[PDB]
């Protein structure tokens, strides 16, 4: 099972600038939980954006994807391949907007989280990826986060 995770604006809009212009504890907890144990496959710009103290992960895997043969990312693995990575029995690609749309065409799962902010789409920004007619969609409850912004959970499947 490969899955896709991540949290966008109503616009589609997941990263700006290398990092992401919101944070909602509950989205943290909520990736944390359905991460937590498996693979986590992500781009090399992700893990530049992860803070070095919280690096790799804990209890995770951690596998980043690089053209940069000799790149080193104490704590995980780095491979020049996305198959190379998709040995384990779970593994959620947690970003960003490049690795996505590498991986779209082995996932069969999509955790989305929804946030509710305005925020148009601007040039250099990283996008969700598209879901076609394949992807089934299941929708939540609109949320308040204690952040102030409102968000739901999508959960879309496919065979
Ligand atoms: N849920 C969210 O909202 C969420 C989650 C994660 C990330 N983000 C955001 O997403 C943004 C980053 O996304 P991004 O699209 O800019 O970069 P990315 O997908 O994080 O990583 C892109 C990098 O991955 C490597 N890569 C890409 N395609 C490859 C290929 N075909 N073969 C080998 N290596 C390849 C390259 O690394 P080298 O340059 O090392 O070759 C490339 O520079 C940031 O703003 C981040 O905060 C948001
Ligand atoms: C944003 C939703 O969950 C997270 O906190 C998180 C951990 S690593 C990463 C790229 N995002
Ligand atoms: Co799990």
């Not at 690096?55 to 995770?60: A, C, D, F």
């Not at 690609?93 to 601007?122: K, M, N, S």
Request: hydrophobic share 40%; glycine share 12%; with cysteine.
């Amino acid at each position: 099972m490969v899955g896709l995770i991540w949290a966008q604006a109503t616009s589609g809009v997941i990263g700006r600038g290398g990092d992401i212009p919101w944070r909602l504890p509950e989205d943290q907890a909520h990736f944390r939980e359905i991460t937590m144990g498996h693979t986590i496959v992500m781009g090399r710009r992700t893990w530049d954006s992860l803070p070095a103290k919280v690096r790799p992960l804990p209890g995770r895997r951690n596998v980043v994807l690089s053209r940069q043969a000799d790149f080193m990312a104490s704590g995980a693995e780095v491979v020049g391949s996305l198959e190379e990575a998709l040995t384990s029995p779970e593994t959620w690609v947690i970003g960003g907007g490049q690795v996505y749309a590498l991986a779209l065409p082995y996932a069969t799962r999509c955790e989305v989280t929804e946030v509710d902010i305005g925020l148009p789409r601007e040039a250099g920004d990283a996008l969700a990826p598209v879901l076609d007619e394949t992807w089934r969609g299941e929708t939540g409850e609109w949320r308040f986060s204690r952040s102030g912004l409102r968000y739901r959970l999508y959960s879309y499947h496919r065979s």
